[PDB]
Amino acid sequence: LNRLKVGLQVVAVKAPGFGDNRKNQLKDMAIATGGAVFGEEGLTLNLEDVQPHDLGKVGEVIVTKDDAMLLKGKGDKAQIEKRIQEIIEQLDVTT
Amino acid sequence: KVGRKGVITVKDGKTLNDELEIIEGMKFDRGYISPYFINTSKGQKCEFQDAYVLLSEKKISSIQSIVPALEIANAHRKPLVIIAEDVDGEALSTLV
Amino acid sequence: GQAFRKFLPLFDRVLVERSAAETVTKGGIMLPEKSQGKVLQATVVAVGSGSKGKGGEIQPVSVKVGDKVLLPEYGGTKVVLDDKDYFLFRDGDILGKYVD
Amino acid sequence: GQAFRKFLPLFDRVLVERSAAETVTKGGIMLPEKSQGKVLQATVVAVGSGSKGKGGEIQPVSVKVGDKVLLPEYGGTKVVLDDKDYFLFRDGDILGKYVD
Amino acid sequence: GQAFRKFLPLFDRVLVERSAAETVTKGGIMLPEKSQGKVLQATVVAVGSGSKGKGGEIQPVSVKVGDKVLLPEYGGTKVVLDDKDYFLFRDGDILGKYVD
Amino acid sequence: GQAFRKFLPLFDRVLVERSAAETVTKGGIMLPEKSQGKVLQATVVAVGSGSKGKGGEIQPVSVKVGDKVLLPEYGGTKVVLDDKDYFLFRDGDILGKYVD
């Protein structure tokens, strides 16, 4: 209703992946975009007190009927590297 | 290694050659309850030294049941391992 | 009666504000915001005029604005004043009063 | 008692009109007309004669026409006056009175 | 009324502390801490001001601080004072008073 | 009021002891201890001070210690005094009084 009556630039999409896979993608996107994940069981972050710095930034987003795209995330490279390193270590532990 | 009356078991290998593996201590085939507790990046392992051991036969549920042990552990500045029948939602959330 | 923030309770109704809940134990361990439930400590912020239940002339309320009180676990009506929470009680429901 | 629009509440009944609900937030975002539910702000438009529940002589109603009041969430009887909505309360049900 | 540990019951409310439950039988056999249930022996620690239910002037409470009492099995409101347990009763609920 | 075995009922409460149940019929046939159920014959052992339900001054209890009474089948609170059983009633619950 707000989008229709004001032209407010908002879009909503389903979370991808099921189970813990969903959580994994959500965290990975959090690091990738420099945002935060709300509602985590550990260190639960509330929606009522969202802050401007808790939202990720992306240079371009394309959404269509089948898929959605964020192109240029603004996550910090050091945390991105940490995430990639931990992922390859997990890959090396159990197959 | 294990004595003339020790326990020896046979298992399928995944390699071209046979191997002898020695198991010491206590193996009981239970994993970590929460990934948040991981403290070693290489291998995703929990490694602690000089830890306190809590053995609970019944499930651990209440904040009142858990707070004294964590208070003691923090007072003594030592790690704690909690072996319990199960951990309930509230205790698990508080711990993590 | 004494009004508070442009609001005055009527008759023997009492308006109070609950104190903030405890967030850290006596040690350094702070507690999840879901576990405290409801706190019974409150401060009286407004007082009604008097009990309609008294025969004849109405008697004044036994409590004054600024008193610190212990509340019951079961009563209270939700009201919102400038986004801060207050609860309306009868004089008879308050469990106790604090003195200094 | 004081009548309003050719209608007078009886005894200690109080007739009030609720104010219009908020439609736009403090910002520029206006809110759907299904989300406000019911508003507790009202203005007193008519006042009854006095409480039958008082022993002996009936006492006058404590509120006057034109007072602004905070209503409870649970009471009220639906009545229609010239297609504008009003609600009938007892003096005892009104949560609060506003003063200027 | 007489306050206790910075707390005073209001009106005819009575604050008491239950004695410790029996832990060993008359012999040498001590009993599991799950079997005693609830004990009805208590000592009066604080006393309210007087009964609001009396018409006219309120009458003083019939019991004094320090009295030993037999409690009913069904009443009581849980309150916590400096981690020791107390229960709030009305004067009318106490089954009996002990004398020396 | 008159105390009994270091215990005194409060206000209009009445303490009584039930007589022993019949164990042998008028003949020579004695009856199983599971069949008598509850007996309504009792003797008054202690008496309260007076009824709080009377307006104004409290009236004295209508019964005296040592009276023999017929009890109702439905009331009574279990209390234990030196391993002998007693029951607490209000003056109004006693069905009857015996006289000699």
Swiss-Prot record, chain A:
Residues bearing the modification N6-succinyllysine: K14, K65
Location in the cell: Mitochondrion matrix
Residues bearing the modification N6-acetyllysine: K5, K27, K65, K72
Associated disease: Spastic paraplegia 13, autosomal dominant: A form of spastic paraplegia, a neurodegenerative disorder characterized by a slow, gradual, progressive weakness and spasticity of the lower limbs. Rate of progression and the severity of symptoms are quite variable. Initial symptoms may include difficulty with balance, weakness and stiffness in the legs, muscle spasms, and dragging the toes when walking. In some forms of the disorder, bladder symptoms (such as incontinence) may appear, or the weakness and stiffness may spread to other parts of the body.
Subunit structure: Homoheptamer arranged in a ring structure. The functional units of these chaperonins consist of heptameric rings of the large subunit Hsp60, which function as a back-to-back double ring. Interacts with 2 heptameric Hsp10 rings to form the symmetrical football complex. Interacts with HRAS. Interacts with ATAD3A. Interacts with ETFBKMT and EEF1AKMT3. Interacts with MFHAS1.
Family: Belongs to the chaperonin (HSP60) family.
Task of the protein: Chaperonin implicated in mitochondrial protein import and macromolecular assembly. Together with Hsp10, facilitates the correct folding of imported proteins. May also prevent misfolding and promote the refolding and proper assembly of unfolded polypeptides generated under stress conditions in the mitochondrial matrix. The functional units of these chaperonins consist of heptameric rings of the large subunit Hsp60, which function as a back-to-back double ring.
Protein name: 60 kDa heat shock protein, mitochondrial
Organism of origin: Homo sapiens (Human)
UniProtKB/Swiss-Prot annotation, chains C, D, E, F:
N6-succinyllysine PTM positions: K26, K38, K52, K54, K64, K68, K78, K84
GO biological process, one term: chaperone cofactor-dependent protein refolding
Induction of expression: By stress.
Keyword Mitochondrion among UniProt keywords: yes
Gene Ontology MF term list: ATP binding; metal ion binding; protein folding chaperone; protein-folding chaperone binding; RNA binding; unfolded protein binding
Modified residues (N6-acetyllysine): K6, K38, K54, K64, K68, K78, K84, K97
Domain of life, per lineage: Eukaryota
Modification Phosphothreonine, positions: T77
Intracellular or extracellular location(s): Mitochondrion matrix
N6-malonyllysine PTM positions: K38, K52, K54
Disulfide cysteine pairs (residue numbers): none
Quaternary structure (record): Homoheptamer arranged in a ring structure. 2 heptameric Hsp10 rings interact with a Hsp60 tetradecamer in the structure of a back-to-back double heptameric ring to form the symmetrical football complex.
Function: Co-chaperonin implicated in mitochondrial protein import and macromolecular assembly. Together with Hsp60, facilitates the correct folding of imported proteins. May also prevent misfolding and promote the refolding and proper assembly of unfolded polypeptides generated under stress conditions in the mitochondrial matrix. The functional units of these chaperonins consist of heptameric rings of the large subunit Hsp60, which function as a back-to-back double ring.
Family: Belongs to the GroES chaperonin family.
The protein's name in its UniProt record: 10 kDa heat shock protein, mitochondrial
